């Protein structure tokens, strides 16, 4: 079953998934890949692995974080948000 190169993912365009850290996640003393997050942080992930762990960057730190720690929501909603110049 000679295995060779087939080709990278298809030229597509999808939007990133935003998730807020509802819990405090800190990387073990021997965990560099583990991303550290705090209660009330936005983890911008672009590469989501089916396995479970995703690749997101937060505060200049990209690491793998558990999905059972963050909650998927719509942080891009005008709800509960006043609109005005130099106001908020």
From Swiss-Prot:
The record's keywords, sorted A to Z, are:
Phosphoprotein, Repeat, SH2 domain, SH3 domain
* Top-level taxonomic group: Eukaryota
Annotated SH3 domain residues: 14-75
Q: Name one GO molecular function term.
A: RNA binding
UniProt GO BP: acetylcholine receptor signaling pathway; anterior/posterior pattern specification; B cell apoptotic process; blood vessel development; cell chemotaxis; cell migration; cellular response to interleukin-7; cellular response to transforming growth factor beta stimulus
A cellular component term (GO) from this record? cytosol
Report the family membership: Belongs to the CRK family.
Function text: May mediate the transduction of intracellular signals.
- Assembly and partners? Interacts with tyrosine-phosphorylated EPOR and INPP5D/SHIP1. Interacts with DOCK2 and DOCK5 via its first SH3 domain. Interacts with phosphorylated CBLB and IRS4. Interacts with BCAR1/CAS and NEDD9/HEF1.
Q: What is this protein called?
A: Crk-like protein
Gene name as annotated: CRKL
Q: Which residues of the full protein are shown?
A: 229 to 303 of 303
